[PDB]
Amino acid sequence: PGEEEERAFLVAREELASALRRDSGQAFSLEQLRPLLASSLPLAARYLQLDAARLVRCNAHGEPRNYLNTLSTALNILEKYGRNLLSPQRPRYWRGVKFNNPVFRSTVDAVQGGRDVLRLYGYTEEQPDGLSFPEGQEEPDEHQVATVTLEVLLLRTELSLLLQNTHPRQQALEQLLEDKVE
Structure with missing residues (x-):
């Protein structure tokens, strides 16, 4: 990982x-x-x-x-x-996320730290049954939201490729997990 290697990535x-x-x-x-x-x-x-x-x-x-x-x-x-927060057609209810939502309950609530990612988007304040933006906030921090969304998109892409045995840097991730995904 040289300086020109860190440069291309940033x-x-x-x-x-x-x-x-x-x-x-x-x-x-x-x-x-x-x-x-x-x-x-x-x-x-x-x-x-x-x-x-x-x-x-x-x-x-x-x-x-x-x-x-x-x-x-x-x-x-x-x-x-994240994509929704950046969308021109953003839901009018975007300011909050409900944990008891059918999709959320079956997906995000299954992983530890799912709520932590939501706060990175801007859902920092505790609302009943979920998280919400501060009341005074008019719009999402689009740059912040775009950065977080990309990393979330990134990590999913890496994990998906692992299952497919097609990750360009497969060995490094299998050493992280210390198990081979067959």
């Missing part, structure tokens, strides 16, 4: 976050994400907003095929919350 990371701001419903290809996937950087360096190591530590229980799927699905839902 740059693509800032650009991809900008891509989300322009089109929130936009889908990202594997080739589009690879500069952030195939980098030889420390885990704590790739995920600055997201605590990837803690997500693994608190959720890696049982078979890899199980908790990686539980994790990907949860991250997928969390990603959508």
